[PDB]
PDB file of C-alpha atoms and ligand atoms in Angstrom:
ATOM      1  CA  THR S   1      -0.260   0.037  -0.085  1.00  0.00           C
ATOM      2  CA  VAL S   2       1.139   3.180  -1.132  1.00  0.00           C
ATOM      3  CA  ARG S   3       0.380   6.459   1.230  1.00  0.00           C
ATOM      4  CA  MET S   4      -0.220   9.341  -0.812  1.00  0.00           C
ATOM      5  CA  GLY S   5       0.479  12.478   0.526  1.00  0.00           C
ATOM      6  CA  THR S   6      -1.388  15.514  -0.331  1.00  0.00           C
ATOM      7  CA  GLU S   7      -1.727  19.046   0.923  1.00  0.00           C
ATOM      8  CA  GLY S   8      -5.798  18.863   0.838  1.00  0.00           C
ATOM      9  CA  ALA S   9      -5.902  22.608   0.083  1.00  0.00           C
ATOM     10  CA  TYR S  10      -4.965  23.671  -3.111  1.00  0.00           C
ATOM     11  CA  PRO S  11      -8.260  23.747  -5.504  1.00  0.00           C
ATOM     12  CA  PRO S  12      -8.463  22.306  -8.190  1.00  0.00           C
ATOM     13  CA  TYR S  13      -5.141  20.824  -7.674  1.00  0.00           C
ATOM     14  CA  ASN S  14      -6.017  19.145  -4.402  1.00  0.00           C
ATOM     15  CA  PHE S  15      -8.523  19.475  -1.456  1.00  0.00           C
ATOM     16  CA  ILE S  16     -10.804  17.860   1.105  1.00  0.00           C
ATOM     17  CA  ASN S  17     -14.193  17.651  -0.248  1.00  0.00           C
ATOM     18  CA  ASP S  18     -17.454  17.977   1.969  1.00  0.00           C
ATOM     19  CA  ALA S  19     -17.528  14.204   2.711  1.00  0.00           C
ATOM     20  CA  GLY S  20     -13.713  14.497   4.171  1.00  0.00           C
ATOM     21  CA  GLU S  21     -12.372  13.105   1.234  1.00  0.00           C
ATOM     22  CA  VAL S  22      -9.104  13.871  -0.952  1.00  0.00           C
ATOM     23  CA  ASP S  23     -10.724  15.469  -4.533  1.00  0.00           C
ATOM     24  CA  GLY S  24      -9.038  16.981  -7.247  1.00  0.00           C
ATOM     25  CA  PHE S  25      -6.858  16.625 -10.350  1.00  0.00           C
ATOM     26  CA  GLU S  26      -4.398  14.826  -8.304  1.00  0.00           C
ATOM     27  CA  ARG S  27      -6.870  12.787  -6.424  1.00  0.00           C
ATOM     28  CA  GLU S  28      -7.947  11.393 -10.043  1.00  0.00           C
ATOM     29  CA  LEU S  29      -4.449  11.088 -11.264  1.00  0.00           C
ATOM     30  CA  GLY S  30      -3.238   9.619  -8.118  1.00  0.00           C
ATOM     31  CA  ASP S  31      -5.369   6.824  -8.102  1.00  0.00           C
ATOM     32  CA  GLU S  32      -5.283   6.052 -11.928  1.00  0.00           C
ATOM     33  CA  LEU S  33      -1.389   6.047 -11.701  1.00  0.00           C
ATOM     34  CA  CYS S  34      -1.569   3.365  -8.998  1.00  0.00           C
ATOM     35  CA  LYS S  35      -4.134   1.746 -10.655  1.00  0.00           C
ATOM     36  CA  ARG S  36      -1.765   1.414 -13.976  1.00  0.00           C
ATOM     37  CA  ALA S  37       1.244   0.691 -11.493  1.00  0.00           C
ATOM     38  CA  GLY S  38      -0.299  -1.870  -9.883  1.00  0.00           C
ATOM     39  CA  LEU S  39      -0.203  -0.550  -6.908  1.00  0.00           C
ATOM     40  CA  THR S  40      -3.393   0.124  -4.101  1.00  0.00           C
ATOM     41  CA  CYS S  41      -3.525   3.231  -2.423  1.00  0.00           C
ATOM     42  CA  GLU S  42      -4.371   5.316   0.858  1.00  0.00           C
ATOM     43  CA  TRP S  43      -4.735   9.085   1.148  1.00  0.00           C
ATOM     44  CA  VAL S  44      -2.736  11.280   3.512  1.00  0.00           C
ATOM     45  CA  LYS S  45      -3.206  14.869   4.409  1.00  0.00           C
ATOM     46  CA  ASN S  46      -0.396  16.588   5.405  1.00  0.00           C
ATOM     47  CA  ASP S  47       0.040  20.678   5.921  1.00  0.00           C
ATOM     48  CA  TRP S  48       2.140  22.539   3.358  1.00  0.00           C
ATOM     49  CA  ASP S  49       4.740  23.821   5.451  1.00  0.00           C
ATOM     50  CA  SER S  50       5.949  20.308   7.095  1.00  0.00           C
ATOM     51  CA  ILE S  51       4.742  18.061   3.745  1.00  0.00           C
ATOM     52  CA  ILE S  52       8.675  17.204   2.807  1.00  0.00           C
ATOM     53  CA  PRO S  53      10.062  16.729   6.365  1.00  0.00           C
ATOM     54  CA  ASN S  54       7.242  14.010   6.656  1.00  0.00           C
ATOM     55  CA  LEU S  55       7.676  12.251   3.628  1.00  0.00           C
ATOM     56  CA  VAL S  56      11.327  12.152   4.945  1.00  0.00           C
ATOM     57  CA  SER S  57      10.056  10.804   8.232  1.00  0.00           C
ATOM     58  CA  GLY S  58       8.211   7.828   6.577  1.00  0.00           C
ATOM     59  CA  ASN S  59       4.900   9.596   7.503  1.00  0.00           C
ATOM     60  CA  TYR S  60       3.485   8.750   3.897  1.00  0.00           C
ATOM     61  CA  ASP S  61       5.407   7.799   0.620  1.00  0.00           C
ATOM     62  CA  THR S  62       4.774  10.408  -2.179  1.00  0.00           C
ATOM     63  CA  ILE S  63       4.191  13.915  -2.151  1.00  0.00           C
ATOM     64  CA  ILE S  64       1.524  14.906  -4.765  1.00  0.00           C
ATOM     65  CA  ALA S  65       0.439  18.711  -4.229  1.00  0.00           C
ATOM     66  CA  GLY S  66       0.988  20.765  -6.877  1.00  0.00           C
ATOM     67  CA  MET S  67       4.767  20.637  -6.198  1.00  0.00           C
ATOM     68  CA  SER S  68       7.110  22.351  -8.932  1.00  0.00           C
ATOM     69  CA  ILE S  69      10.257  20.398  -9.227  1.00  0.00           C
ATOM     70  CA  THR S  70      13.170  22.617  -8.259  1.00  0.00           C
ATOM     71  CA  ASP S  71      16.957  22.212  -7.770  1.00  0.00           C
ATOM     72  CA  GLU S  72      16.599  23.195  -4.128  1.00  0.00           C
ATOM     73  CA  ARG S  73      14.134  20.495  -3.323  1.00  0.00           C
ATOM     74  CA  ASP S  74      16.140  17.918  -5.401  1.00  0.00           C
ATOM     75  CA  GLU S  75      18.614  18.487  -2.712  1.00  0.00           C
ATOM     76  CA  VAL S  76      16.119  16.458  -0.222  1.00  0.00           C
ATOM     77  CA  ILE S  77      13.964  14.445  -1.984  1.00  0.00           C
ATOM     78  CA  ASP S  78      13.545  12.884  -5.407  1.00  0.00           C
ATOM     79  CA  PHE S  79      10.936  14.146  -8.156  1.00  0.00           C
ATOM     80  CA  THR S  80       9.391  11.774 -11.145  1.00  0.00           C
ATOM     81  CA  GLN S  81       9.044  13.997 -14.509  1.00  0.00           C
ATOM     82  CA  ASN S  82       6.406  16.434 -14.642  1.00  0.00           C
ATOM     83  CA  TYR S  83       2.587  15.472 -14.911  1.00  0.00           C
ATOM     84  CA  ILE S  84       1.385  18.988 -15.532  1.00  0.00           C
ATOM     85  CA  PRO S  85       3.533  21.118 -18.215  1.00  0.00           C
ATOM     86  CA  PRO S  86       5.382  24.256 -16.394  1.00  0.00           C
ATOM     87  CA  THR S  87       2.416  26.920 -15.996  1.00  0.00           C
ATOM     88  CA  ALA S  88       2.807  30.690 -15.136  1.00  0.00           C
ATOM     89  CA  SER S  89       2.955  32.426 -11.749  1.00  0.00           C
ATOM     90  CA  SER S  90       1.050  35.656 -11.358  1.00  0.00           C
ATOM     91  CA  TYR S  91       0.038  38.988  -9.296  1.00  0.00           C
ATOM     92  CA  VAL S  92      -3.680  39.280  -8.138  1.00  0.00           C
ATOM     93  CA  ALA S  93      -4.870  42.281  -6.591  1.00  0.00           C
ATOM     94  CA  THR S  94      -8.039  44.496  -5.433  1.00  0.00           C
ATOM     95  CA  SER S  95      -7.075  47.087  -7.907  1.00  0.00           C
ATOM     96  CA  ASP S  96      -5.397  47.991 -11.291  1.00  0.00           C
ATOM     97  CA  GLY S  97      -2.692  50.343  -9.773  1.00  0.00           C
ATOM     98  CA  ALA S  98      -1.882  47.671  -7.289  1.00  0.00           C
ATOM     99  CA  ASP S  99       1.593  48.580  -5.817  1.00  0.00           C
ATOM    100  CA  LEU S 100       3.489  44.994  -6.849  1.00  0.00           C
ATOM    101  CA  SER S 101       6.916  46.761  -5.107  1.00  0.00           C
ATOM    102  CA  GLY S 102       4.694  47.076  -1.897  1.00  0.00           C
ATOM    103  CA  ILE S 103       3.499  44.118   0.450  1.00  0.00           C
ATOM    104  CA  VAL S 104       3.485  40.746  -1.323  1.00  0.00           C
ATOM    105  CA  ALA S 105       1.633  37.715   0.141  1.00  0.00           C
ATOM    106  CA  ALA S 106       2.951  34.416  -0.905  1.00  0.00           C
ATOM    107  CA  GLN S 107       2.352  30.984   0.929  1.00  0.00           C
ATOM    108  CA  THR S 108       5.488  29.920   2.760  1.00  0.00           C
ATOM    109  CA  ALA S 109       7.770  27.313   1.161  1.00  0.00           C
ATOM    110  CA  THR S 110       7.153  27.950  -2.520  1.00  0.00           C
ATOM    111  CA  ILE S 111       8.671  29.184  -5.500  1.00  0.00           C
ATOM    112  CA  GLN S 112       6.511  31.945  -5.162  1.00  0.00           C
ATOM    113  CA  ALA S 113       7.737  33.040  -2.276  1.00  0.00           C
ATOM    114  CA  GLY S 114      11.252  32.668  -3.567  1.00  0.00           C
ATOM    115  CA  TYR S 115      10.758  34.770  -6.291  1.00  0.00           C
ATOM    116  CA  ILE S 116       9.392  37.690  -3.572  1.00  0.00           C
ATOM    117  CA  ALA S 117      11.935  37.375  -1.294  1.00  0.00           C
ATOM    118  CA  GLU S 118      14.526  37.954  -4.066  1.00  0.00           C
ATOM    119  CA  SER S 119      12.690  40.648  -5.423  1.00  0.00           C
ATOM    120  CA  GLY S 120      12.236  44.473  -4.327  1.00  0.00           C
ATOM    121  CA  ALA S 121       8.880  43.605  -3.027  1.00  0.00           C
ATOM    122  CA  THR S 122       7.965  42.849   0.580  1.00  0.00           C
ATOM    123  CA  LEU S 123       7.203  39.705   1.313  1.00  0.00           C
ATOM    124  CA  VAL S 124       4.742  38.114   3.637  1.00  0.00           C
ATOM    125  CA  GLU S 125       4.218  34.535   3.730  1.00  0.00           C
ATOM    126  CA  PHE S 126       1.006  32.482   5.154  1.00  0.00           C
ATOM    127  CA  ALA S 127       0.727  29.051   6.015  1.00  0.00           C
ATOM    128  CA  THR S 128      -2.254  28.040   3.424  1.00  0.00           C
ATOM    129  CA  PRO S 129      -3.383  29.309  -0.023  1.00  0.00           C
ATOM    130  CA  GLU S 130      -6.380  30.722   1.460  1.00  0.00           C
ATOM    131  CA  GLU S 131      -4.535  32.820   3.817  1.00  0.00           C
ATOM    132  CA  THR S 132      -2.903  34.526   0.913  1.00  0.00           C
ATOM    133  CA  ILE S 133      -6.268  35.226  -0.880  1.00  0.00           C
ATOM    134  CA  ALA S 134      -7.610  36.512   2.705  1.00  0.00           C
ATOM    135  CA  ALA S 135      -4.834  38.756   3.026  1.00  0.00           C
ATOM    136  CA  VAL S 136      -5.585  40.997  -0.279  1.00  0.00           C
ATOM    137  CA  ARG S 137      -9.069  40.641   0.361  1.00  0.00           C
ATOM    138  CA  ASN S 138      -8.689  42.149   3.554  1.00  0.00           C
ATOM    139  CA  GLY S 139      -6.376  44.682   2.864  1.00  0.00           C
ATOM    140  CA  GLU S 140      -3.464  43.742   4.953  1.00  0.00           C
ATOM    141  CA  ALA S 141      -1.361  42.890   1.276  1.00  0.00           C
ATOM    142  CA  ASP S 142      -1.091  44.846  -1.937  1.00  0.00           C
ATOM    143  CA  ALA S 143      -1.219  41.885  -3.728  1.00  0.00           C
ATOM    144  CA  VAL S 144      -0.639  38.209  -3.777  1.00  0.00           C
ATOM    145  CA  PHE S 145       1.778  36.149  -6.387  1.00  0.00           C
ATOM    146  CA  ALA S 146       0.941  32.440  -6.826  1.00  0.00           C
ATOM    147  CA  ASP S 147      -0.012  30.252  -9.699  1.00  0.00           C
ATOM    148  CA  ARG S 148      -1.778  30.807 -12.259  1.00  0.00           C
ATOM    149  CA  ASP S 149      -4.044  27.880 -12.592  1.00  0.00           C
ATOM    150  CA  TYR S 150      -4.803  28.090  -8.634  1.00  0.00           C
ATOM    151  CA  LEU S 151      -5.585  32.158  -9.090  1.00  0.00           C
ATOM    152  CA  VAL S 152      -7.639  31.769 -12.446  1.00  0.00           C
ATOM    153  CA  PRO S 153     -11.030  30.262 -10.798  1.00  0.00           C
ATOM    154  CA  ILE S 154     -10.289  32.541  -7.735  1.00  0.00           C
ATOM    155  CA  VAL S 155     -10.413  35.724 -10.122  1.00  0.00           C
ATOM    156  CA  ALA S 156     -13.562  34.487 -11.827  1.00  0.00           C
ATOM    157  CA  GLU S 157     -15.303  33.948  -8.711  1.00  0.00           C
ATOM    158  CA  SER S 158     -14.668  37.277  -7.135  1.00  0.00           C
ATOM    159  CA  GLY S 159     -17.337  39.190  -8.983  1.00  0.00           C
ATOM    160  CA  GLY S 160     -14.929  41.664  -9.943  1.00  0.00           C
ATOM    161  CA  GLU S 161     -13.249  42.100  -6.267  1.00  0.00           C
ATOM    162  CA  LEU S 162     -10.210  40.286  -7.723  1.00  0.00           C
ATOM    163  CA  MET S 163      -8.187  40.726 -10.703  1.00  0.00           C
ATOM    164  CA  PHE S 164      -4.817  39.991 -12.761  1.00  0.00           C
ATOM    165  CA  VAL S 165      -2.142  42.817 -12.813  1.00  0.00           C
ATOM    166  CA  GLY S 166       1.369  43.029 -14.088  1.00  0.00           C
ATOM    167  CA  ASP S 167       2.685  40.431 -15.920  1.00  0.00           C
ATOM    168  CA  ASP S 168       2.750  36.334 -15.861  1.00  0.00           C
ATOM    169  CA  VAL S 169       6.481  34.991 -14.154  1.00  0.00           C
ATOM    170  CA  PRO S 170       7.618  31.550 -15.536  1.00  0.00           C
ATOM    171  CA  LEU S 171       8.800  29.629 -12.480  1.00  0.00           C
ATOM    172  CA  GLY S 172       9.521  26.124 -11.698  1.00  0.00           C
ATOM    173  CA  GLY S 173       9.788  22.839 -13.585  1.00  0.00           C
ATOM    174  CA  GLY S 174       6.050  21.817 -14.090  1.00  0.00           C
ATOM    175  CA  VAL S 175       4.763  19.968 -11.284  1.00  0.00           C
ATOM    176  CA  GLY S 176       5.779  16.597 -10.553  1.00  0.00           C
ATOM    177  CA  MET S 177       5.668  13.593  -7.412  1.00  0.00           C
ATOM    178  CA  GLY S 178       8.198  13.966  -4.944  1.00  0.00           C
ATOM    179  CA  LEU S 179       9.698  10.734  -3.027  1.00  0.00           C
ATOM    180  CA  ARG S 180      12.174   9.894  -0.980  1.00  0.00           C
ATOM    181  CA  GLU S 181      15.593   9.994  -2.844  1.00  0.00           C
ATOM    182  CA  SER S 182      16.013   6.043  -1.508  1.00  0.00           C
ATOM    183  CA  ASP S 183      12.766   5.310  -3.131  1.00  0.00           C
ATOM    184  CA  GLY S 184      14.032   4.763  -6.708  1.00  0.00           C
ATOM    185  CA  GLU S 185      12.058   1.706  -7.409  1.00  0.00           C
ATOM    186  CA  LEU S 186       8.387   3.361  -6.121  1.00  0.00           C
ATOM    187  CA  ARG S 187       9.646   6.487  -8.640  1.00  0.00           C
ATOM    188  CA  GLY S 188      10.574   4.273 -11.744  1.00  0.00           C
ATOM    189  CA  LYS S 189       6.861   2.830 -11.170  1.00  0.00           C
ATOM    190  CA  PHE S 190       5.462   6.245 -11.334  1.00  0.00           C
ATOM    191  CA  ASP S 191       7.516   7.538 -13.588  1.00  0.00           C
ATOM    192  CA  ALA S 192       6.363   4.510 -16.229  1.00  0.00           C
ATOM    193  CA  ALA S 193       2.833   5.238 -15.041  1.00  0.00           C
ATOM    194  CA  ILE S 194       2.928   8.957 -16.033  1.00  0.00           C
ATOM    195  CA  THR S 195       4.695   7.962 -19.497  1.00  0.00           C
ATOM    196  CA  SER S 196       2.002   5.283 -20.326  1.00  0.00           C
ATOM    197  CA  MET S 197      -0.482   8.251 -20.036  1.00  0.00           C
ATOM    198  CA  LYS S 198       1.222  10.829 -21.771  1.00  0.00           C
ATOM    199  CA  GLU S 199       1.675   8.433 -24.875  1.00  0.00           C
ATOM    200  CA  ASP S 200      -2.382   7.527 -24.913  1.00  0.00           C
ATOM    201  CA  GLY S 201      -3.541  10.694 -24.374  1.00  0.00           C
ATOM    202  CA  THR S 202      -5.659  10.465 -21.033  1.00  0.00           C
ATOM    203  CA  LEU S 203      -3.158  12.951 -19.134  1.00  0.00           C
ATOM    204  CA  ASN S 204      -4.058  15.710 -21.477  1.00  0.00           C
ATOM    205  CA  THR S 205      -8.024  14.925 -21.052  1.00  0.00           C
ATOM    206  CA  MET S 206      -7.607  14.845 -17.513  1.00  0.00           C
ATOM    207  CA  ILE S 207      -5.371  18.092 -17.462  1.00  0.00           C
ATOM    208  CA  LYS S 208      -8.287  19.846 -19.822  1.00  0.00           C
ATOM    209  CA  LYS S 209     -10.718  18.458 -17.541  1.00  0.00           C
ATOM    210  CA  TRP S 210      -9.914  20.124 -14.482  1.00  0.00           C
ATOM    211  CA  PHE S 211      -7.823  23.182 -15.827  1.00  0.00           C
ATOM    212  CA  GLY S 212     -10.070  24.136 -18.748  1.00  0.00           C
ATOM    213  CA  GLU S 213      -9.845  23.675 -22.541  1.00  0.00           C
ATOM    214  CA  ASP S 214      -7.235  26.223 -22.905  1.00  0.00           C
ATOM    215  CA  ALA S 215      -4.698  24.364 -20.544  1.00  0.00           C
ATOM    216  CA  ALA S 216      -1.074  23.627 -21.464  1.00  0.00           C
ATOM    217  CA  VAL S 217      -0.657  20.106 -22.503  1.00  0.00           C
ATOM    218  CA  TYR S 218       2.023  17.585 -23.636  1.00  0.00           C
TER     219      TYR S 218
HETATM  220  N1  LIG N 301       4.125  24.842  -7.305  1.00  0.00           N
HETATM  221  C1  LIG N 301       4.387  26.133  -6.692  1.00  0.00           C
HETATM  222  C2  LIG N 301       3.250  26.753  -5.590  1.00  0.00           C
HETATM  223  C3  LIG N 301       2.794  25.372  -4.815  1.00  0.00           C
HETATM  224  C4  LIG N 301       1.725  25.909  -3.752  1.00  0.00           C
HETATM  225  C5  LIG N 301       1.113  24.613  -2.923  1.00  0.00           C
HETATM  226  N2  LIG N 301      -0.340  24.980  -2.019  1.00  0.00           N
HETATM  227  C6  LIG N 301       5.552  25.339  -5.521  1.00  0.00           C
HETATM  228  O1  LIG N 301       6.349  24.306  -6.053  1.00  0.00           O
HETATM  229  O2  LIG N 301       6.394  26.116  -4.545  1.00  0.00           O
HETATM  230 NA1   NA N 302      17.345  14.257  -4.957  1.00  0.00          NA
END
């Protein structure tokens, strides 16, 4: 049994539905990958801040949680190939003239937080994605910098209270599954399953289903 670790707070990638079950793109993907690898799985929810150390300590066996493949994270864990192509990061604000060099909210331990910390903007970090949106809505922050695919439905749901500002920024290597560095054989099973979904078009279909007809595909 493979314990699949996810954040459960990052729609539409992953979330806990009203039944208390893991749901989202990654629920469907993860289940189909395990089916194709011949593995049975069990889903484990873990907060983003500790999702890497808790994989390393053996609380679960994979991270499938919208995590970009990066060299920095490759220092402690190993990634499969990407299962979504690299997509942009974007700024979101309550007005068009928001000061993007002011206070910018980003989720802790993300490439977006890293980009803002290196920038001239003042970074404020929040534990969860929803807290970054709340910080903008309530005026504690000038804007939020986050994954564009996370922000698109949020902007559409806002009834005009939230909007994209500035330009998109490409960050990170595409989303991939994380595993312990001593787990090469399991990682290889997942890699072989991902490749099979790329080859037969089922991954592209899953991506468009969850991210829209215009989503980047393979
Ligand atoms: N893909 C970005 C954002 C992840 C956001 C998780 N709620 C990263 O890996 O840092
Ligand atoms: Na590594």
